[PDB]
Design a protein around this ligand. Structure first.
Ligand SMILES: [Ca+2]
Ligand SMILES: [Ca+2]
Ligand SMILES: [Ca+2]
Ligand SMILES: [Ca+2]
Lengths: 102, 102
């Protein structure tokens, strides 16, 4: 434990959910599905986003990614998915931290 | 800065660093440079990468990204940069976290 940064832990928190989902949430020799991918991001980002309206922002990304017929989510293929969410609302994010308030 | 999940906070920890670097570290009307980008990733990932040898993994990304001669680093452009780091060593990451340990 004991030495890793919170940035290290944050890159890790994005890999926790990757391995969680790729593995256990059906099958580890490989099942996933871009349906439950849209729910998983709604468990974990339950407060990041302002509405059903804001959902379409992630739904456009979720479309533009694994409409690819590989049956794989890859490490950075999972990242650009939510890195593309983290731009329009990322203005409010900075604001929260620079004011430290929430 | 509270009520949010640690996944929400992790997506935020990557945006703390985005605004830290793009803005404050030199100039907000636009300075950046892939020199201090290689250093910034070495402040915050002081342990994720296993050596100078492993550095070439991130150096390849740091090179290949702003081969886009925009003169900017952008929200998800900052993500694929370190999302490409978060794969070969992401095997060891999972291992740490599945043991809850180190
Ligand atoms: Ca699975
Ligand atoms: Ca895929
Ligand atoms: Ca700057
Ligand atoms: Ca650029």
């Amino acid at each position: 434990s004991d030495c890793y940064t919170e940035l290290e832990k944050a890159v890790i928190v994005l890999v926790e959910n990757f391995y969680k989902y790729v593995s256990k949430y059906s099958l580890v020799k490989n099942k996933i599905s871009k349906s439950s991918f849209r729910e998983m991001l709604q468990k974990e980002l339950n407060h990041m986003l302002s509405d059903t309206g804001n959902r379409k922002a992630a739904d456009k990304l979720i479309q533009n990614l694994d409409a690819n017929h590989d049956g794989r989510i890859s490490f950075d293929e999972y990242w650009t998915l939510i890195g593309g969410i983290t731009g329009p609302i990322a203005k409010l994010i900075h604001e929260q931290e620079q004011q430290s308030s929430s």
